[PDB]
């Protein structure tokens, strides 16, 4: 089932069916070129474009450089047959990758069946094909066959990376805009790609790579295919509809050319730059064009130039345009079907949806302009796959989009010179005599300022409410399930035939569709300014590579006037520390302190509880970009609290919402029904008005405000990168200043330091993204929406007055219902429709914020060991290798629980990927796992340290070892300097939370501060590891008892995880509560609570008591008896007796399955073991007093007494509750105890039901089930 059903090579001999020389439309005479038919109506011509446009028969650069950010020229590209074969295979591979996805499958299918309309006949009763939509294919015998087609993929023109859709036009018809459609020629190259900067994904992928990221070529092809799909159905937006920009201010760009068609093609937030008025305009325009096509098909009487029947062509176009055919065969356009088709072609065929489907990193908007050009090679499967692209699965490239990172996947991307040279199109910004200091600012580094006329509206135009006035439906955001709805109802069966048409002329005559004449925007415009701009602050933080020591400086002045001075917004103490000359012996500590200070200042966040919509503030944004004005960062914080987000904007945007058009109501005399319908329609149209103004404000916000915030965010990323690079340059100068002897004695890897500063910047960018997003949303909510809400309330007042007059005018007609209609009007119009941001923007759903947090935790795991299906595997994207020993025991009930014995064959080995093995001096990392350590019984375990988890290589790495009441974490560098942290639990204790119980261990390692060990989510100990050098961990992680002298010793372990960052306390608590399996009850040791298993009982209010039965029968009772006693082995353990007292057995009553696992809210029976035989726990609910004394009864003697027990699991999940219920479903109360004289009897009490969960008063009815375990092993 491939889209290309044949293996095509460029040296394959011509056959005239799918491989042949062809001639397409041309201005004059054209040399035939070899082309390949890869699918129906889909041809590929591996040739440079010198024929489609006669003005571009030259592959040399144009007279003036194109006003594009990135351009590349190579007249020698795609000349050799090897290059052409590579091109053909790459295009084939990209088509296969697109067709593999659901959305791409639909897109290609729609392209194939969108045959250009046969509108060439001057006579309305005939159907004649248009020549320019066809080609001539030369046959082996020398004759040529004219064939109609839909799409041709050819190589680029002079500019290699300028990809676009071309089509040959008509004398009078605009085929791409009248619904007809024309054959589309896409200029494309699969051997090159763009390189862009991204910082938004650090929230979910904090391990994002540094430097540029490379666009997946499949996305660019899909973009051009969507252009082709718009053009083939004749619904392409007019290329003179351009989003105008203001180019007069110093901060504004010199000029930008983007089309409404391009904005529609992009989708996402870019498509929302168009208001709803113009969208409805476009929809109705193309609707009437489709109706034109329908009427043309109707008045048709014959076909010309082919052997195919007229009815067949009518059917083909019926399926292309989804026309409705009535009982007489006449065609018409259904509004519903046209809606589906137009929405699918315009709103679903978007680059954003293809980004969602391809699972690749890509720019969220067109304003994230490309920055570099990279040579690639996608044909080899080791470099690029149909299903994964550059992000090859089960490799380092699969995680964090590292396949697209030009620095990590460097063998796949070779940087090329950008022919758009540095500062080719720019503005000259000068600061007045602080003579003039002037900087060139690149055009695409300036601010996008949309013009006001782009946001046209008729909000001030009134409407006439009729009883027939149509109420509109919703506008569902394009979600993935709607795409699936169209996918499941899509028809992939019919494909139009490649019919036989009458032969055209030898040379097809035709020219491209005329493009509007675009003016080159002004360049080099000089501005004379009184204040330093944000561009000056960002420029002052740059420098040139060289030998000379660059020095940091807090004076923007001094930095701007010296190449060897770099401005920094850090503290002056940082400047003094970095610029000082440091000796060799003090070099490593110097670098560590510099890293610590860099991370401290970049991660600085000031929480505010004084303003509503903003919760955090990053202060250094002030001096980083001169946001606002004033001296300190305290000015920035205070002015942000006082004024609001408005200080972050470079231009205050006009949010002009006029007086809303009032409704005029038509009067229907002596007619009750139509009058009440008019009233209802007026109210509904008022609701629609509320939604319309909200949508207009959201569009203005997305175009005018959010773009400025995005540019500020990009510039913050750039400033952080500049600071990091400057610090690295100074440190490496200092290192290189040394004699090479000192350079041998100091093991310094600057790439390691570059990494460390990279993730510090990633954290800083997480904070900056959150803060700036909050600022943009706050400005929308507080500074723009209220103008609306005011205008809307005024409209409500006007509508209320007009209605009330309308109702009192038809008082005779609405006889009796005057009061009800009056109340309806007054009550509906006295309320406000609240503005909900989740309704108009896809980003701001709360569930997505929760998902972002959980993903951020997940995506930091470089190793995640879980038991899936029938094997223990690595669920991380790296997918390391797992070798399971022959004597590794998995728990049959919970196969995640792994038992390791003191045997050589009871071992688990993890072969790590070469890109995730630890070898650094600065990279923090963490580990977490659940371990169950049995009690120690022998004195041979005293002072016997044995490793269980091993990642040591030549005495360097990390290990987890065990000793008598000791969990030990050991770090050791390559210099054999080692540090150990310990958690100690004593065996001389009544009841222990750690002995033979599941323990959640977490070890975090900050290479600059400390190694911390946490138990059950609480910090336990820490040791300073800042004095450790370079650590080289092992290529494999070994789980096995190593050196354990206790022959019968074993451990239990589950849910092992290795993370690439230092977890904070909150994250560790989240992990502890997440991995608790909160839906399942647990026994005392932490395992799964099971049916038909005997459990001794513990009461959490009085742990020193055990359940005993005074007498069997209805006249007897059960009570808590103490003390438990003590079991001991001298100098080893002295613990309370746990196996004392009566036993409970949980019996299945209403279980809908057979697994013997007690889940939450399970209705069960409970048996009591007395003298090694089972009775039933029950009570008489009709006895006086809320406290119902429980008793152990003979099983055949229970009768109709209260016995049904509802179980509850409260957080491990050790805390267990038992709510008793009679046979009528009523509550008897939770099972705890109550004092009767001396004896505390077991009692069902409804007083517990009256207490809030987790309250201290609920600790009396909290229970702990204790089964006999080999880890405890006292005498039963």
């Amino acid at each position, epitope marked *: 089932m491939p889209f290309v059903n044949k293996q095509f090579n460029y040296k394959d001999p011509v056959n005239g069916v799918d491989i042949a020389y062809i001639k397409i439309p041309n201005a004059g005479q054209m040399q035939p070129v070899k082309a390949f038919k890869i699918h129906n109506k889909i041809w590929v011509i591996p040739e440079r474009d010198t024929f489609t446009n006669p003005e571009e028969g030259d592959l040399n650069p144009p007279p003036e450089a194109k006003q594009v950010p990135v351009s590349y020229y190579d007249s020698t590209y795609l000349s050799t047959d090897n290059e052409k074969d590579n091109y053909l295979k790459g295009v084939t591979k990209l088509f296969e990758r697109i067709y593999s996805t659901d959305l791409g499958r639909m897109l290609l299918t729609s392209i194939v069946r969108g045959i250009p309309f046969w509108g060439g006949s001057t006579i*309305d009763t005939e159907l004649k094909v248009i020549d320019t939509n066809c080609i001539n294919v030369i046959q082996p015998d020398g004759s040529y066959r004219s064939e109609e087609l839909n799409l041709v993929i050819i190589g680029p023109s002079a500019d290699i990376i300028q990809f676009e859709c071309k089509s040959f036009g008509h004398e*009078v*018809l*605009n085929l791409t805009r*009248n619904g007809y459609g024309s054959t589309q020629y896409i200029r494309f190259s699969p051997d090159f790609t763009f390189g862009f900067e991204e910082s938004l994904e650090v929230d979910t992928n904090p391990l994002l790579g540094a430097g540029k990221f490379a666009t997946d070529p499949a996305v660019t092809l899909a973009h051009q295919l969507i252009h082709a799909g718009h053009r083939l159905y004749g619904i392409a937006i007019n290329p003179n509809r351009v989003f105008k920009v203001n180019t007069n201010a110093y901060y504004e760009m010199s000029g930008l050319e983007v089309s409404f068609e391009e904005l529609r093609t992009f989708g996402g937030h870019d498509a929302k730059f168009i208001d709803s008025l113009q969208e409805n305009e476009f929809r*109705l*325009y193309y609707y*009437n064009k489709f109706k034109d096509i329908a009427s043309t098909l109707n008045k048709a009487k014959s076909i010309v130039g082919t052997t195919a029947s007229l009815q067949y062509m009518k059917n083909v176009f019926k399926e292309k345009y989804l026309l409705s055919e009535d009982t007489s065969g006449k065609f018409s356009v259904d509004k519903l079907k046209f809606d589906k088709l137009y929405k699918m072609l315009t709103e679903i065929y978007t680059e954003d949806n293809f980004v969602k489907f391809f699972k690749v990193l890509n720019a969220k908007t067109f304003l994230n302009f490309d920055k570099a050009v990279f040579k690639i090679n996608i044909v080899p499967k080791v470099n690029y796959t149909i299903y994964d692209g550059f992000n090859l699965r089960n490799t380092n490239l699969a995680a964090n989009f590292n396949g697209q990172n030009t620095e990590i996947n460097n063998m796949n991307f070779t940087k090329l010179k950008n022919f758009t040279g540095l500062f080719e199109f720019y503005k000259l910004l000068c600061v007045r005599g602080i003579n003039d200091l002037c900087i060139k600012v690149n055009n695409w580094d300036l601010f996008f300022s949309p013009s006001e006329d782009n946001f046209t509206n008729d909000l001030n*135009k009134g409407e006439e409410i009729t009883s027939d006035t149509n109420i509109e439906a919703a506008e569902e955001n394009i979600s993935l399930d709607l795409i699936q709805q169209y996918y499941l109802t899509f028809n992939f069966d019919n494909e139009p035939e490649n019919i036989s048409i009458e032969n055209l002329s030898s040379d097809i005559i035709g020219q491209l569709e005329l493009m509007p004449n675009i003016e080159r925007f002004p360049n080099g415009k000089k501005y004379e300014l009184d204040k330093y701009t944000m561009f000056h602050y960002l420029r002052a933080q740059e420098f040139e590579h060289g030998k000379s020591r660059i020095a940091l400086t807090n004076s923007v002045n001094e930095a701007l006037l010296n190449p060897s001075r770099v401005y920094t917004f850090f503290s002056s103490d940082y400047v003094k520390k970095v610029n000082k000359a440091t000796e060799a012996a003090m070099f490593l500590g110097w670098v560590e302190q510099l890293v610590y200070d860099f991370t401290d200042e970049t991660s600085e966040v000031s929480t505010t509880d004084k303003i509503a919509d903003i919760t955090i503030i990053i202060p250094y944004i002030g001096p980083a970009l001169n946001i606002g004005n004033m001296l300190y960062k305290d000015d920035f914080v205070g002015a942000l609290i006082f004024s609001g987000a408005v200080i972050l904007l470079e231009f205050i945007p006009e949010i002009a919402i006029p007086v809303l058009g009032t409704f005029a109501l038509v009067s229907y005399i002596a007619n009750k029904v139509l009058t009440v319908q008019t009233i209802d329609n007026a109210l509904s149209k008022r609701n629609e008005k509320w939604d319309e103004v909200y949508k207009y404000i959201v569009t203005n916000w997305l175009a005018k405000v959010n773009t400025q915030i995005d540019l500020i965010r990009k510039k913050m990323k750039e400033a952080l990168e500049n600071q990091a690079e400057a610090t690295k340059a100074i440190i490496n100068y200092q290192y290189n200043q040394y004699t090479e002897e000192e350079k041998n004695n100091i093991n310094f890897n600057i790439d390691d330091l570059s990494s460390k500063l990279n993730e510090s910047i990633n954290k800083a960018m997480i904070n900056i993204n959150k803060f700036l997003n909050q600022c943009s949303v706050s400005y929308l909510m507080n500074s723009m929406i209220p103008y609306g809400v005011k205008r809307l309330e005024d409209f409500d007042a006007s509508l209320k007055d007009a209605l009330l007059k309308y109702i009192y005018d038809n008082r005779g007609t609405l006889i009796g219902q005057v009061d009800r209609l009056k109340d309806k009007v007054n009550n509906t119009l006295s309320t406000d429709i609240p503005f909900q941001l989740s309704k108009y923007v896809d980003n701001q759903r709360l569930l997505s914020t929760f998902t972002e947090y959980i993903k951020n935790i997940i995506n930091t795991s470089i190793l995640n060991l879980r038991y899936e299906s029938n094997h223990l595997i690595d669920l991380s994207r790296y997918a390391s290798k797992i070798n399971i020993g022959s004597k590794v025991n998995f728990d049959p009930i919970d196969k995640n629980q792994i038992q390791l014995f003191n045997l050589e064959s009871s071992k688990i080995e993890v072969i790590l990927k070469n890109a995730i093995v630890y070898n650094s001096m600065y990279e923090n990392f963490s580990t977490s796992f659940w371990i169950r350590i049995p009690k120690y019984f022998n004195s041979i375990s005293l002072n016997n340290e044995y490793t269980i988890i091993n990642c040591m290589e030549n005495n360097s790495g990390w290990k987890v070892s065990l000793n008598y009441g000791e969990i030990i974490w050991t770090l050791q560098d390559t210099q054999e300097i080692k540090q150990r942290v310990v958690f100690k639990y004593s065996q001389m204790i009544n009841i222990s939370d750690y002995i033979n119980r599941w323990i959640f261990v977490t070890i975090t390692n900050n290479r600059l501060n400390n190694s911390k060990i946490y138990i059950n989510g609480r910090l336990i100990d820490q040791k300073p590891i800042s004095n450790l050098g370079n650590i080289h961990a092992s290529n494999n992680i070994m789980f096995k008892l190593d050196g354990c002298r206790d022959t019968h010793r074993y451990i239990w372990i589950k849910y092992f995880n290795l993370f690439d960052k230092e977890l904070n306390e909150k994250e560790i608590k989240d992990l502890y509560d997440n991995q608790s399996n909160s839906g399942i009850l647990k026994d005392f040791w932490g395992d799964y609570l099971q049916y038909d298993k005997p459990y001794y009982m513990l009461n959490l209010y009085d742990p020193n008591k055990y359940v005993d039965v005074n007498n069997v029968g209805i006249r007897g009772y059960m009570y808590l008896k103490g003390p438990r006693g003590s079991v001991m082995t001298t100098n080893i353990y002295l613990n309370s007796s746990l196996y004392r007292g009566t036993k409970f057995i949980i019996k299945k009553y209403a279980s809908g399955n057979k697994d013997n696992i007690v889940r939450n809210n399970d209705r069960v029976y409970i048996n009591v073991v007395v003298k090694n035989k089972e009775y039933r726990l029950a009570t008489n609910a009709s006895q006086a007093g809320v406290e119902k004394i429980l008793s152990a009864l003979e099983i055949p003697d229970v009768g109709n007494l209260s016995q049904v027990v509802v179980m509850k699991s409260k957080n491990i999940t050790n805390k267990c509750k038992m709510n008793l219920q009679d046979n009528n479903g009523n509550d008897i109360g939770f099972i705890g105890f109550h004092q009767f004289n001396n004896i505390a009897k077991l009692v069902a009490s409804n007083w517990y039901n009256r207490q809030i969960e987790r309250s201290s008063r609920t600790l009396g009815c909290s229970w702990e089930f204790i089964p006999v375990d080999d880890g405890w092993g006292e005498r039963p």
Partner: nanobody
Amino acid sequence: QVQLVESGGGLVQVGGSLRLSCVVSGSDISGIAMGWYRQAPGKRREMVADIFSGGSTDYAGSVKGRFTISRDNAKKTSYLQMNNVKPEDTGVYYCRLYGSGDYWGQGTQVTVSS
């Protein structure tokens, strides 16, 4: 119900000028595109010009540079100014409102005489 009424058609000499107008009743025609088509004797009714509510224009090949389409949303009227007319411009001109329906006018005859 929506109604389109055209006016201003007559016979015109080669190179002369003629102004066609069309008024709308029953709809505000704000945010709604408009167009002028012409039907030659024996040929299909063909697009001549289109104008959007924002004022953007889209012309055919044989008519560009000689005809100018304008509109007034306030007066709910579409205009087509025909300058430097040629014998191919003879036919019945129809106005169209690209709205919720196939809103057409009655049609007015333009004959270029020489």
